[PDB]
Design a protein around this ligand. Sequence first.
Ligand SMILES: NC(=O)C1=CN([C@@H]2O[C@H](COP(=O)(O)OP(=O)(O)OC[C@H]3O[C@@H](n4cnc5c(N)ncnc54)[C@H](O)[C@@H]3O)[C@@H](O)[C@H]2O)C=CC1
Ligand SMILES: Cc1cc2nc3c(=O)[nH]c(=O)nc-3n(C[C@H](O)[C@H](O)[C@H](O)COP(=O)(O)O)c2cc1C
Ligand code: SF4
Ligand code: SF4
Ligand code: SF4
Ligand code: SF4
Ligand code: FES
Ligand code: FES
Ligand SMILES: [Mg+2]
Lengths: 59, 230, 433, 43, 217
Amino acid sequence: RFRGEHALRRYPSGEERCIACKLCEAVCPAQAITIEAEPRADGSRRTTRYDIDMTKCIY
Amino acid sequence: SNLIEVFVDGQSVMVEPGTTVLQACEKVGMQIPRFCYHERLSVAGNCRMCLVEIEKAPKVVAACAMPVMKGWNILTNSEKSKKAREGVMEFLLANHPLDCPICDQGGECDLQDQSMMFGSDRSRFLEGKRAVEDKNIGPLVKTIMTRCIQCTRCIRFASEIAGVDDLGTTGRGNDMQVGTYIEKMFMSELSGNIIDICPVGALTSKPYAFTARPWETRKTESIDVMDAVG
Amino acid sequence: APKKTSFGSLKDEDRIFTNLYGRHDWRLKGAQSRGDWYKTKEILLKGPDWILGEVKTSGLRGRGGAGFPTGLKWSFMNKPSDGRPKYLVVNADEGEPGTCKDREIIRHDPHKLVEGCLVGGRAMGARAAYIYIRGEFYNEASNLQVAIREAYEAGLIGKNACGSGYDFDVFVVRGAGAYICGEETALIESIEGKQGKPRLKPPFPADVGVFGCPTTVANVETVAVSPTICRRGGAWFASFGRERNSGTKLFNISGHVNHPCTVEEEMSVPLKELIEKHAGGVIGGWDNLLAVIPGGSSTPLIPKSVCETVLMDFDALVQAQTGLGTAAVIVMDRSTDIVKAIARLIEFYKHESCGQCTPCREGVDWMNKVMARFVKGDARPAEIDSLWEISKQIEGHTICALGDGAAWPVQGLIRHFRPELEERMQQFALQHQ
Amino acid sequence: FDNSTYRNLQHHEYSTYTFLDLNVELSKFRMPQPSSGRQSPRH
Amino acid sequence: GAGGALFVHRDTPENNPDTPFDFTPENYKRIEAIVKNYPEGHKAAAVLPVLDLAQRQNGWLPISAMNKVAEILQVPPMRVYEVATFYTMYNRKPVGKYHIQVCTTTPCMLRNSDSILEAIQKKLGIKVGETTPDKLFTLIEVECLGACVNAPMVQINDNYYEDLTPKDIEEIIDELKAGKIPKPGPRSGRFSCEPAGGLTSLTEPPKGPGFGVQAGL
Ligand SMILES: NC(=O)C1=CN([C@@H]2O[C@H](COP(=O)(O)OP(=O)(O)OC[C@H]3O[C@@H](n4cnc5c(N)ncnc54)[C@H](O)[C@@H]3O)[C@@H](O)[C@H]2O)C=CC1
Ligand SMILES: Cc1cc2nc3c(=O)[nH]c(=O)nc-3n(C[C@H](O)[C@H](O)[C@H](O)COP(=O)(O)O)c2cc1C
Ligand code: SF4
Ligand code: SF4
Ligand code: SF4
Ligand code: SF4
Ligand code: FES
Ligand code: FES
Ligand SMILES: [Mg+2]
């Protein structure tokens, strides 16, 4: 259960898991996440910006 | 006067004849749940979310299409109305896709909000869901028909407000699909309003896709300058 | 002696449909020998009020299945003219599984129906009658057209009906394979060239019907008799059956009986007497009976223990929690998979739902899947109560009564044959570990 | 008077246009239809 | 089971707007007679009979036929599409010369309808959604046809064949594909809805006109 440095994961095929729903951004108590998104070249719903300010994050 | 007396939860209200149960209820600040009723569109009655209990009547009535009678006492929060709402939302969500994170209607969905306010919190649907192929109606509007709840608001808007009779339903029963039945562009100077009237993500804006969520946006009230209508 | 207590044996002199078996000429000349079109001119000259009163005192109720009192229903349309023409629509959709009565009337006694349309239209002040017939009944529709041609040729209908100076037209309209088009509002929408989707009530057809004009929708059987009731008296009709269950009824006995048939009988006949006398008894003897659906698929079924003393009328079948319906008796013996039969009925209802309203459109398909899994025993006993509550949600929340008719057989099966479901579930459980 | 026979045998020789031919034949007996006042609701 | 068919149209050389379809002059007279029945100012009520007439002339309903019907009655083509897709008697795909419907609802299911269906299948060698390679038979299942008392029955091109057995249906099939046409009706020496044997009611001759007429009329 230990909470440590953040990381963005992938599916076994190598595709990113994140779909830019922004639920993590809306729930972050410290407002440490900033997200921008758009349709990818294949039409997939993927982020273009995903920042986490680790000096704002409360882990 | 011509006004008649009706009671909403034991409270007297005076309304003009022909007024529906929904309007009589909203004259005291009570908003009946709805999916297919729009006040600028002709009444449909198909969704069945507006069913309320009239006192001393064994049957629940569609508040969006039933005019109030003299002396009726509406019961907007009785056990019968709540059970009707829960059943209707259960049926609505039975075949709905688990698309909320990838849906642009995420924080702006009447399905979501009315499920949180009037529906249940669990599911007892243990079957497979249905899937509907997408229909292309042009560049401006993105179509994801699986999400459609068959309210038919878009059809009424096209037929009446826009004067374009291109949208309809094909088939019947569970496999009933809203579309044009042919590859056709739904082109109109007012074609973008079917995005707003659609309560779900079945009709969404294509230029706006995936860029933002409703809770992030800051709302500024302004005036349009693209024509002289203002 | 008055106030009869036993019913179920009427002789041929009191049978309205005297050519039910097509054994006499159905052509105008043969129908006139049977008394058709006799004193029509006088009946029309009596007036709409006289005919409405004759129907009222006759105690007749709607033969389509709902059993609504025909007198008040037809008097709802006795309003003064407001600029809109008034129409009669005769429901010949004939969609209920197990039911075959209207087909025989149309194909064997069409002049009865034509005269009934004329008399009923005069009673309601209707300008013309539209007959909506099932699209599969192509030969029946053409026979009806031949009868209407004969009536037009003889001056019985059209301009200046028989002698009354009352103009009345009889049109025939064919549907295209939709059981939902038997709903009166769905039928009206189908006549207007739209999808066969029911309307909401109110308004009622007596206010806004076909083409947005007052309309009365009546069953073919209900309409055909109308002429006979007016002639033989109406009070004669009330002498049959119990109170508020008056008159004569046409029964369709199908399923596991020795001789399936369509027969005419008194209203309050007991079910066992009817099956034993006309159908020739259950296959393998009366002891082999398992369950019976008394009034078509839309009504809940009853076990053999209830069929022993039940009367075949509206109120007695209501007391047995099944209702009379269309009086189409489907018989199931002890050699049938009853769960499979109810699942087939539910699949029928799934394939016939119009899809307009949410409860029917999703819940009927949901019950269809649940019953498909029940047939194999692929469920667990809590799903029985889950299905009961699903059926309950569907019932009373739909626009038309097709959701009611899909929920009721499910409730009947759960009520009377829950142990069979549990046995199947446990068999599937232990068979598959 | 007999019952051994079957009298509804005319439908054994009906074609695919019987119903519409009968409708065409009956077209000359009907009363004039009432009018709404418009050619169509879209007028 | 499921519908199987699709409720969307995709263009094809056999089915496109430019596919030639038009009504014969006799069919135009029939359309005029059909239109006349309905009230002036209401013509959309004639879409059902006109569309059925087009299907009868052509054998099925291409997109061009739907467009022609919409043009003749001056209605939006979408409404004609709705009617064509809603009703199951309309063929939006070509069918065989003899289109067979087998009823499989519970009253016919009780009287061994599955035997009839499998007899047809092994006689023709096709499944319940296919057409024979010579395009002469198309076999499907349908709901109650209203011939439940005479069940098990199948309907062929506007004809009812009731009280069937596998031998009877095979005889009907091989008589139909020889160029003849079998006589409709029951195949059990019954030729009506009467009880199988005995005619328990209506044994007396029908009464004369005015026999029970009440007084004062
Ligand atoms: N013969 C067949 O093939 C089939 C028959 N049915 C039967 O249809 C029955 C249900 O049909 P519904 O029409 O929905 O029943 P219903 O109770 O709603 O009304 C039946 C008749 O009574 C009239 N009516 C009822 N209330 C009225 C009012 N307040 N004012 C004026 N008129 C009124 C209606 O206009 C209608 O004509 C079922 O019991 C079913 O057994 C169902 C399917 C097929
Ligand atoms: C799903 C559904 C199907 C129906 N099908 C028929 C039908 O085939 N024939 C019929 O006469 N009535 C049918 N009804 C009921 C009709 O409303 C009824 O015929 C009509 O009210 C005439 O009633 P009456 O016989 O009392 O005049 C159906 C109702 C429902 C809900
Ligand atoms: S936006 Fe956040 S919550 Fe949504 S998928 Fe990406 S990481 Fe997960
Ligand atoms: S329309 Fe609403 S309920 Fe449906 S997937 Fe999108 S956000 Fe979720
Ligand atoms: S697309 Fe939207 S507006 Fe149109 S019927 Fe479906 S849910 Fe209603
Ligand atoms: S209950 Fe079923 S058939 Fe009736 S209107 Fe609703 S969806 Fe259509
Ligand atoms: S809002 Fe009333 S039924 Fe849809
Ligand atoms: S069940 Fe087969 S004809 Fe009705
Ligand atoms: Mg939307």
